[PDB]
Design a protein around this ligand. Structure first.
Ligand SMILES: [Zn+2]
Ligand SMILES: [Zn+2]
Lengths: 119, 113, 48, 272
């Protein structure tokens, strides 16, 4: 069964916009914007543990990703936890500075095959 | 709750209503002196519920209840499931929004719904 | 007994909505809790 | 105030962008001889020599010798392929960078506002290395009291002041109009210089009435959604409208709506 699509409650002001709150929202979009890191963390976590996309970690990651996608329409920050960060990256990424670990999943097999083909 | 004394009799005045004059007057029962009233106010009391004097300390009246605690929501900065939830209005928003404050003594983090 | 403690449990259909149990409990508390009129009024007076 | 003349805005903007680039220093272009020479000259040849000097990668120490040795369509372009010239500005915490009249696609606003093409300016906020601003550069976290309270930095106030007052380049001052949904992720925003004929408020009230929406993010999204590139067609009046009921089913206490953005069209209208 698919995940629920129930979004966050809308935030309605008691007065009209004074052209300053829109600027505050625009500036605040730069901070607490974890849209790009949630997908990478989910991919890394799915690569690491077996029976991927079945544990509660993947469900929480999907919920956070949906909330972050909905952040553009409703002002609800994603609030990415610190303990959910990957801290490890597979071989098929451009994060050379970050620690790189050998991946043994289907993506790792594809990367090994393409490396053997190009070499 | 407003008592005044006549300038001639120096006794307590009793409020009364005159049908012909249709005005508020004060008269004392000792001397026949009816003075004019000011502001047409005969009673004024600040509503206070301190009827149990010298008894609210021994007996827990529970005037300020404690906020409820839940163990379903999980905090972000720490992996602690216990948090307090309550409803309060925002700075400018209209309506009630559910808040969450982490109960971990070492976390001290609060967030919205 | 004067205290007459009771116990009410929430239904299982509120789990579908996000944070449904908390909202339901808060609505029930706001609905069936006594709030006297004296706690709302600040100044009481009689004017002719 | 140093110039104090009728110098054109476009040439001044090109010179300022050239100074911003690592081609000519500020003092080398602030001399009286350069402005005196460039004040009286044909516009097309002046633009040609300016772009010829700007395109060279070498740092030109003395542009006077270089410029001495060197010596309508917008409407049809918009109607054909929506080709417009836009001024792109990069705002950094240290300085500002102007790219210039880079040719790009056209949106709906410039279709009905094709006169003030130079007034539109795309402004994005980046770091010194023209990268996305990190989270620690704005509102760093700090624990004061019982709970953690974020503390705004000077860059936050600088961005707020820039968005409020605006950028003053020559005889212009660009205000804030709106930002699209795509630009919100890219940290970009449109700016328009106020003019006697039309101002920012005029376009704001012409696009629509946004006081009905009481939400902050929703109002901005609905104001900026009318900026995607689209091709012009015929005009449809308001008398050829109708209201048809939609469908909505509630199962297991969940509101599920089928008709979210669906619609109907005829064959003659599709052919037209
Ligand atoms: Zn008396
Ligand atoms: Zn916590």
């Amino acid at each position: 069964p698919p995940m629920d699509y129930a979004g966050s409650r809308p935030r309605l002001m008691d007065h009209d916009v004074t052209l300053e709150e829109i600027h505050k929202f625009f500036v605040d979009y730069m901070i607490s914007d974890t849209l790009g890191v949630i997908s990478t963390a989910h991919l890394v976590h799915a690569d690491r543990d077996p029976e991927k996309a079945r544990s509660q970690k993947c469900l929480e990651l999907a919920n956070l990703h949906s909330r972050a996608v909905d952040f553009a329409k409703t002002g609800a920050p994603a609030e990415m936890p610190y303990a959910l960060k990957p801290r490890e990256f597979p071989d098929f990424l451009e994060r050379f500075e970050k620690p790189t670990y050998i991946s043994e999943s289907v993506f790792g097999k594809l990367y090994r095959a393409v490396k053997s083909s190009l070499a | 709750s407003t008592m005044k004394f006549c300038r001639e009799c120096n006794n307590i005045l009793y409020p009364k209503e005159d049908k012909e004059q249709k005005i508020l007057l004060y008269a004392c029962r000792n001397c026949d002196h009816q003075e004019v009233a000011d502001n047409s106010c005969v009673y004024r009391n600040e509503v206070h519920h301190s009827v149990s004097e010298r008894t609210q300390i021994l007996t827990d009246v529970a005037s300020d209840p404690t906020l409820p605690r839940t163990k379903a929501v999980r905090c972000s900065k720490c992996q602690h499931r216990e948090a307090v939830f309550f409803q309060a209005t925002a700075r400018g928003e209209e309506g009630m929004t559910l808040f969450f404050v982490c109960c971990n003594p070492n976390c001290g983090h609060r967030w919205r719904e | 007994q004067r205290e007459q403690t009771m116990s009410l449990y929430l239904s299982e259909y509120l789990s579908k909505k996000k944070h449904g149990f908390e909202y339901g409990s808060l609505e029930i508390k706001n609905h069936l809790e006594k709030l006297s009129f004296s706690e709302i009024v600040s100044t009481s007076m009689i004017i002719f | 105030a140093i110039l104090g003349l009728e110098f054109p805005y476009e040439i001044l903007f090109q010179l300022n962008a050239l100074v911003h680039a690592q081609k000519i220093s500020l003092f080398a272009a602030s001399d009286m001889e350069l402005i005196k020479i460039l004040r009286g000259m044909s516009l097309e040849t002046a633009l040609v020599i300016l772009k010829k000097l700007h395109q060279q990668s070498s740092i030109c120490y003395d542009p006077v010798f270089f410029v001495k040795t060197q010596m309508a369509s917008a409407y049809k372009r918009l109607t054909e392929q929506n080709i417009m010239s836009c001024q792109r500005a990069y705002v950094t915490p240290s300085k500002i960078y102007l790219l210039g009249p880079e040719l790009e696609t056209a949106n709906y606003v410039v279709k009905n506002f094709a006169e003030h093409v130079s007034d539109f300016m795309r402004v994005t906020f980046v770091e010194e290395d023209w990268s996305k601003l990190p989270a620690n550069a704005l509102s760093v976290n700090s624990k004061e009291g019982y709970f953690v309270k974020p503390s705004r930095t000077n860059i936050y106030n600088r961005v707020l002041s820039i968005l409020g007052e605006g950028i003053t380049v020559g005889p212009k001052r660009f205000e804030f109009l709106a930002f699209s949904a795509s630009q919100l992720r890219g940290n970009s925003v449109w700016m328009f210089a106020s003019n006697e004929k039309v101002k920012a408020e005029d376009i704001r009230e012409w696009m629509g009435c946004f006081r009905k929406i009481r939400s902050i993010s929703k109002c901005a999204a609905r104001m900026g959604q009318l900026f995607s590139a689209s091709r012009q067609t015929l005009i449809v009046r308001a008398q050829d409208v109708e209201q048809i009921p939609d469908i909505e089913v509630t199962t297991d206490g969940a509101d599920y709506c089928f008709s979210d953005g669906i619609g109907k069209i005829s064959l003659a209208f599709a052919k037209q």
